[PDB]
Design a binder for this molecule. Structure first.
Ligand SMILES: NC(=O)c1ccc[n+]([C@@H]2O[C@H](COP(=O)([O-])OP(=O)(O)OC[C@H]3O[C@@H](n4cnc5c(N)ncnc54)[C@H](OP(=O)(O)O)[C@@H]3O)[C@@H](O)[C@H]2O)c1
Ligand SMILES: NC(=O)c1ccc[n+]([C@@H]2O[C@H](COP(=O)([O-])OP(=O)(O)OC[C@H]3O[C@@H](n4cnc5c(N)ncnc54)[C@H](OP(=O)(O)O)[C@@H]3O)[C@@H](O)[C@H]2O)c1
Ligand SMILES: NC(=O)c1ccc[n+]([C@@H]2O[C@H](COP(=O)([O-])OP(=O)(O)OC[C@H]3O[C@@H](n4cnc5c(N)ncnc54)[C@H](OP(=O)(O)O)[C@@H]3O)[C@@H](O)[C@H]2O)c1
Ligand SMILES: NC(=O)c1ccc[n+]([C@@H]2O[C@H](COP(=O)([O-])OP(=O)(O)OC[C@H]3O[C@@H](n4cnc5c(N)ncnc54)[C@H](OP(=O)(O)O)[C@@H]3O)[C@@H](O)[C@H]2O)c1
Lengths: 106, 328, 328, 106, 106, 328, 106, 328
């Protein structure tokens, strides 16, 4: 389970993101870091994972994996939509605590 | 249940029986041509339509005698599934590997020896480190598009190499493979059980397992020693004779005695239980058999009756006796 | 109007007459070869260029006699449109379905029996649940690119399956189908009228309807009982005889008497009105006919004269008599 | 009329959006939810629907279908342009009333 | 010179825009509305026009053609960069006057 | 300058001489086979390598006699450029148009009549409104990929149709056309001069013009009336005789007298000036000639000497005399 | 070493940028301007350079080459992330000094 | 080390020996057929499998005698690598260049003269300015897909043209080239050493160098003058004789005396050191040799023994003597 080298394409409502597998398998307890949980979104005809979800929220989700654990909400996205995206992608309790600490009232 | 019960090879449209007949050591070597014709007639009359050969077996001569049966009895081409394997073609440097030149020349020579126009599946016998994957996938797509084959598959590849071949085929709009040939018996369980279901659920690649009786070990004929006219007593099989007569072989024979007690309780024989144990899951599409005479083939066909008797209690008892279940 | 008035099959460039001749029960079965040659000569001399057969009709033998007419009279190949249908090829497991192997082998065997180099359209006779759509579309594109066919179409498919085939063909840069064969007469109106115009307006798939006289029911010959030398009195057609002699058949015969009164008011016969009723809309490109002798074919050709007399009042009166107009 | 499973590609002036058909047929009285009204924008050579219209306004239109009925104007889009887009895509009177209530003066 | 029906693809540094020809030929005195002036940017291998220029400025340029003549500067683009883009695409003197009137000091 | 001075056909790699020989009315009709062989030998010995025919000329018979020259004299295939045109193939409905079936069958029949394996360019003779552009471009790409042709082009198409064919070919990764055949002489100047340079500068499509002497009008032989053994006095050419003997023909003859005075001042003849006037710009790659005997061909070849004498003053004087320069 | 004419495709986490080679070789001492330093990011199967990095920061990096040397931070990107991107792409000491002068406290 | 030590040609799957035999001046010209058969037998018995010819050598006649060896001795086709080069095919205008027509016709004529079905690599002998790159790459992909060749490469192209061919092949999903033929000896060092490693590391294009002895100059036979029966004394090689007898040749002979002193210190001969100097880096896959008799070939094969003796000190001493190392 070295999980390295391969390139992964993620399709969010027509918007395409590309990354490496060793970026994703730094956090094995999330939705994208676990092969058992993301296998139901795979598309065999196009070799990609498809999600029918909110488009501007996924850049912060990808930067959470790329930066090593930093959560920063985008300016044009409200609080509850980003909270629902964090709850869907299963980033954990400490990511929610860091998001509450970074956004004032928490 | 297995033979004259047909299922798809992977997720493709090709339908095969779950027992096949192999063209290793016996054909062109150990047995004669009349015995080979008798074995092929006995296999064809019971509903088996899958026959598997290679270009390295008996310097290709086995392929020749396979053609000499098919042209003789006058069977229809549309009712048979013929597969071939290509890695080794000669002693020169350019006559081996998975390059474009050797794939085209080896498939043409194998079709010339078989007296056929096409095969159904063409396999790569082992991976090639000196060739890029794009050249191999383009050569397989080229020989499919020329009408020399219908499908292609791999053999002894890892999961990363099969996924790389699928990714290269999807990148350049080419043909992905459909099947993988792997070894599977009661003492070799890791690759079929922990690696291949992910590839079956993800990209729909099926499995076609070989050597179900471990070259005759799980049949139970070596409980005393090495009997005459067996595979272990032939010239050039000193490795199998050293494997039988080592210290692990006695523990394997004791476990085989316990499994023979279970199989005699069920009302069958030990090779029938060993063959029907491999087909208990849906990830395995077919099992390739080997036989040396007609009595062995008629005994090995009878695992269809003992396949539906395998409940969860008998499987748990067999896994308790064997004690080599892989963790996943 | 229908025959010797040509129109495009769907939105493609192939132009056909709106009357065709079919190769079901009569050819190779009920009628002889001289009657078949007389029917083909009478159809060809009136401007009909569309002839439709299949590999399952009379164990393929009908296809053989079709070739025995075309090579005999010396007609040009460029003035004919020949179609074939492929699903059933034999009793073995690998000789049926819509896999790549059976499509290639069945088209080669049908071209060998027809003594031809190519057909114009090759149809899939029914959908296949065991095969992926990508394999079927790739096999059809392969047999078009080898010069064995010009176009391909479907038969008895639903709208979702045709849309899936179009989407798969547009995804991998392949060839989409052009036509659909459906059943359409006065007592079977749903699929042609409420489902197929959306596919014609969206992706340009045309319709080629079959059985316009409901195997002879709407001709009106069964008003008393079962006459001799009919299709219902033949061996192996007990289902049609049970369908005629049931309780719904009497209501169908009463409605047929009222429609015969309308057709006798118009100055024609009931089969001519029944044939010309199917061609009143632009979604239908052609109608395939069946005939048992030359008088029936010469009567069925005469619906061209009664086609332009169908105003909206007569159509509304027919829809008031029938009372089975589908809601959309 | 189950209207489920198929993937739909919508092309807004070169910007591509992908969704499912059961997302679109939740609201059958709109332009995108009715097959009779959207059939004049279909492109048969590319298997997509093409609109020659404003690009940043369509993300809120897609999130109206994806969120279940919530209207939120983007920050970089003015009032009258977004009102014209709501009027073109035929979202209804109650969507206009919700947009007026969510934007102050209505 | 009906100039209608055909679809035109414009490539700005990797960002693709699609429009119709009758949208472009409403203003025949500009760079994109004149076939003699835009012919030196055509790429025959890809069937598109390529410009090696600023990416966020072209959405307002396309909305000038699509809206019928309205000029609105994007928020994240400075004054002088947008003025240089208006000068490059040759929108005219009255478009510059409307841009000066819409931006205060003019 | 024109003949034995070679240039690329459009922007492709095919290099042709700027004088070609046509296979209209004379071949198979007006002249005999020995005169045709003499004309082909005289054209080949002066460096002309371009010969253009069609399947509609003399019911195809002209194509037959073209083959009867090429097999007789034993010329190499690699030193010749042969083109054919396909729209009209017979009296049946399916034997005309630009569908896939008629393109494949017409090209096979034309290659059978020419006794050749391939042609260099295959042209579509006129546009087809009943066929989609994608089917035509796919059929042309198919016949190029089977080795039956090398390139393809159009004839009598507008600029929008050529641009649509280019856009369809770039969309589906197919082969675009390379050339357009248009009519161009001193009284037909619009399409070559105001429409085609944009297509040459944009997508690199060249022009190959036909009828440079307006079927013999600009030669000046009709200054008195209709001489015997001319094209206007043949059976079936009443339209040309009515065009000559109308009221516009007298003004054309007066302008031809003034142009003959200019050509006699330059030291040449009027057909040489008329042929060399068409090659003064770089948008025209070649000019197809027609001749009825050897003296006419030997006179028409001599426009190479009068091509470099055309300065801007003589061109401005000719444009002042003609008075039909199109505005752009 | 004329370094002109060819088109270069740069892929930042699925976002594609296209430019010319003479735009890139104006600054030969950077990462993208030197063929020896950018050769380890080349992808031979797709004919592009791939970077697994931050997506909104690269527009300012491309405009630094296209404008002739001007550095302007995007609004939605923080200070330290853009400083790390400037440090990765090796723009030099004077670009860092211009970025410090353009952002106040430097 | 070089011969009977095999390596990949570039990054492809084709494996060649690092010594090859060329088919220039000797074959069909200077030497007889029996000497050519003796040279081919001596090359084949030592493990050399690479043979390189062209269609311009001795008006094609050399290719003919190459076929007359291969059909005579009965060697297997799968153990040989045969390459051909195509630019010049005749005196006509359409018989030269890199257009589609000349590539297809020249490859068919070369395969007809060689009595073969296919070659392994087909090279473009020099770049063509009159043809677009897309047409050349599509023609090479077409002749690979028809089974007339396996791979293709370039010769005397610059780095920008090879990169343009790679970019065009990746744009339209076509086949990129795998190899480049360049000149490389001790007085021609720029292109192999400073330009080609970037193409090898970037897109995996290998190099196959030719003329390692500078047409016999670095062998040292011209230390006095022009001996009889040499290449410089033949008819039609006045340029080589003027190059030898100029003022730079004396400095080259003095440097050759110093290099001969080094090679005599190492225990070898000067041509063996000159051949083994070219294979010291991994960017060069193979070296093509030329020989006039069997003693020269048996001497040139012996550079395998002197290849592993080249340390860094001897390479630095050779670079100090030569003084022409390119700056990078
Ligand atoms: N993909 C690959 O690389 C690969 C490699 C190897 C093989 N294969 C395939 O595997 C297939 C199976 O070959 P296999 O021989 O290894 O399978 P196997 O069934 O495990 O071998 C059984 C051997 O034991 C003997 N035997 C069979 N039934 C018996 C019975 N009831 N009682 C006692 N002895 C019995 C037979 O001859 P003896 O009595 O003389 O021992 C037979 O040779 C081959 O045909 C080949 O196509 C594939
Ligand atoms: N796509 C598919 O799966 C499919 C399936 C089935 C058929 N088809 C096609 O449908 C075509 C039409 O076949 P069909 O026979 O069902 O069409 P049909 O016209 O509805 O059948 C008419 C039958 O009634 C009789 N008949 C014809 N004209 C008559 C007349 N004026 N008066 C009295 N009887 C008359 C004929 O023989 P009798 O008098 O002996 O009854 C004929 O067999 C076939 O050729 C086949 O190619 C396609
Ligand atoms: N793309 C298309 O659809 C299309 C259509 C039509 C033709 N074409 C091509 O055009 C080519 C040219 O045909 P064309 O005959 O129309 O060209 P043309 O040169 O304009 O016709 C000249 C005619 O006048 C006569 N003539 C020739 N030279 C003469 C001279 N010095 N003095 C007096 N009379 C002379 C000849 O016979 P007479 O003396 O008997 O008159 C000849 O038939 C044809 O071969 C055909 O391939 C193409
Ligand atoms: N890609 C291209 O365009 C291109 C162009 C040219 C050649 N090539 C290839 O290059 C290959 C090599 O040809 P080449 O002749 O130029 O290579 P070369 O090895 O440099 O030529 C050596 C010449 O010197 C003589 N010689 C060879 N060994 C000798 C020895 N020990 N002592 C004294 N003389 C010796 C031989 O005949 P003599 O004694 O009579 O001189 C031979 O002709 C050709 O086969 C051809 O395939 C390719």
């Amino acid at each position: 389970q070295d999980c390295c080298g391969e390139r992964v394409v993620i399709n969010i409502s027509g918007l395409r993101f590309e990354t490496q597998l060793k970026t994703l398998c730094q956090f094995p307890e999330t939705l994208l870091g676990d092969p058992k949980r993301r296998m139901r979104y795979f598309d065999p005809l196009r070799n990609e994972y498809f999600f029918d979800r909110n488009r501007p929220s996924f850049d912060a989700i990808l930067y959470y994996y790329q930066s090593g654990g930093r959560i920063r909400r985008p300016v044009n996205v409200p609080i509850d939509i980003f909270s629902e995206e964090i709850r869907f992608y299963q980033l954990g309790e400490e990511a929610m605590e860091k998001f509450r600490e970074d956004e004032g009232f928490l | 249940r297995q033979l004259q019960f047909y299922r798809n090879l992977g997720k493709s449209g090709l339908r095969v029986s779950c027992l096949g007949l192999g063209t290793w050591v016996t054909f062109g070597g150990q047995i004669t041509d009349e015995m080979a014709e008798q074995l092929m007639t006995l296999a064809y009359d019971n509903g088996i339509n899958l026959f598997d050969t290679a270009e390295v077996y008996a310097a290709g001569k086995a392929e020749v005698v396979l053609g000499n049966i098919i042209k003789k009895k006058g069977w229809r081409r549309s009712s048979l599934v013929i597969t071939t394997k290509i890695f080794w073609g000669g002693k020169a440097e350019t006559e081996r590997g998975l390059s474009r030149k050797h794939i085209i020349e080896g498939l043409k020579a194998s079709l010339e020896r078989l007296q056929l126009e096409y095969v159904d599946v063409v396999f790569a016998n082992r991976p090639d480190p000196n060739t890029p994957m794009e050249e191999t996938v383009r050569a397989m797509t080229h020989v499919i598009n020329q009408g020399m084959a219908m499908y292609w598959g791999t053999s002894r590849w890892s999961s990363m190499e099969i996924m790389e071949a699928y990714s290269v085929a999807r990148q350049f709009n080419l043909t992905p493979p459909i099947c993988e040939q792997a070894e599977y018996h009661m003492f070799q369980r890791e690759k079929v059980e922990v690696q291949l279901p992910e590839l079956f659920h993800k990209i729909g690649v099926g499995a076609m397992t070989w050597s179900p009786l471990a070259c005759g070990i799980v049949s139970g004929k070596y409980d005393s020693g090495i009997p005459p006219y067996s595979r272990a007593s032939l010239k050039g099989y000193q490795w199998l004779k050293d494997k039988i007569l080592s210290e692990e072989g006695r523990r394997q024979q004791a476990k085989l005695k316990e499994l023979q007690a279970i199989a005699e309780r069920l009302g069958c024989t030990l090779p029938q239980l060993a063959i029907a144990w491999c087909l208990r899951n849906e990830g395995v599409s077919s099992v390739l058999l080997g036989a040396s005479n007609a009595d062995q083939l008629m005994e090995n066909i009878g695992a269809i009756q003992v396949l539906p008797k395998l409940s969860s209690s008998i499987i748990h008892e067999i896994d308790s006796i064997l004690g080599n279940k892989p963790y996943s």
